[PDB]
């Protein structure tokens, strides 16, 4: 089997957060649609798969000219991991060699140009992940973690809590929009973060993710201006 | 000397972000006032000191029946540390034994009740700090830190990045509202975080910090609701 570059868009119907959000529209196009358009315009992929439990999402995906994989209910439940859905997609189409890129519909401001630039960072030989990320508002060294019995432990050093921010290393958080991996690597590791992980840095604005009604309205604002 | 429980309220005049904010009113009472009220109603303190270079700030403090320390210009500049201000206040009143608690005017939704509950966590034998903190919107284990420009390492494990959040230890950040220490320990270490540090957890809402006019309006609307 030849290598294929695969895009997998996991888009189950249920969202406790914002109801049916994968088909909620922004500027007239569903969230699913905006992500499908990003995948297509990137020209990075041989095949674009929407994996869904089915129904109106499956129909929407077919209207965009992309493939549909039907996940059983267990793999589209509230607890089902994203990795298990991507592994299932790959097994269903029978691809185990090339690249696999997770594109979440919840990042509608992530464009095809973003995908292309992230792809530029992917090393075919080295095969570490490329993951989109954004800067952190609150520095994650300036935190403590709850441990047992009402105690806490610093993230790193107690001295970090008082350290001038700019003397700490720069921190980024993965933003959910893009995860690129080598396919055989992802299958073998059963995860999206494979070392050496590269980050594709996006602004806060382009990193907005849709969990609530207010995120939807805010993202739509950002589109228009 | 006999031990004393000291509250120190640093309230400099020349705030740059929100002009003159320490006397800006929120529902009829100055920021200074709200924190003084909280210190008095807590009943945790033997003495309450407002340290300031501002004449109007000193008057306001006197009007609430608490002590005023005059802060020299050098300890009231834009870059003067809080620790140097507390050390000076303690030196000025001649207290070097008991506890000392920093109560920033910029946390006006922090109440006497919050202060009293935090105080209950302090251990006179062990003498670690008690610091108020709030939950993190973004989990600090789900971050990566820049190690040499182009390279990033996970905060802790690669696997943390994709772990479902509810399976990670809960995380918190200092909110600036309350820092309780042993006085001799604070003087010897010249810092606010002394091991073993414990947190007093506050809501995001009660943790609101006043850095802007909009912040002040938000706090006021919160008290109104
Ligand atoms: N096993 C999974 C996990 C996530 N998703 C999808 O991937 C995106 C990211 O999901 P997220 O917003 O983190 O949480 P949800 O599971 O969407 O929403 P809810 O939690 O309210 O059900 C969404 O488009 C969601 O539908 C999916 O299809 N299948
Ligand atoms: N050395 C210090 C540091 C801080 N503060 C006070 O502590 C609170 C928190 O500090 P910050 O929010 O930074 O306020 P300002 O320094 O007053 O404002 P700006 O930073 O906008 O100049 C404020 O009541 C501030 O006046 C102080 O009196 N002396
Ligand atoms: Ca969000
Ligand atoms: Ca300041
Ligand atoms: Ca501030």
Curated annotation (Swiss-Prot), chains A, B:
Keywords: Cytoplasm, Nucleotidyltransferase, Transferase
GO cellular component: cytoplasm
Protein origin, superkingdom: Bacteria
Entry EC number(s): 2.7.7.43
Entries under Gene3D superfamilies matching the protein: Spore Coat Polysaccharide Biosynthesis Protein SpsA, Chain A (3.90.550.10)
Cellular compartments annotated: Cytoplasm
Primary location group: cytoplasm
GO terms of molecular function: N-acylneuraminate cytidylyltransferase activity
Coiled-coil features, chain-numbered ranges: none
Reaction(s) the record says it catalyses: an N-acylneuraminate + CTP = a CMP-N-acyl-beta-neuraminate + diphosphate
Recorded family membership: Belongs to the CMP-NeuNAc synthase family.
Protein name: N-acylneuraminate cytidylyltransferase
Source organism of the structure: Neisseria meningitidis
Classification lineage: Bacteria, Pseudomonadati, Pseudomonadota, Betaproteobacteria, Neisseriales
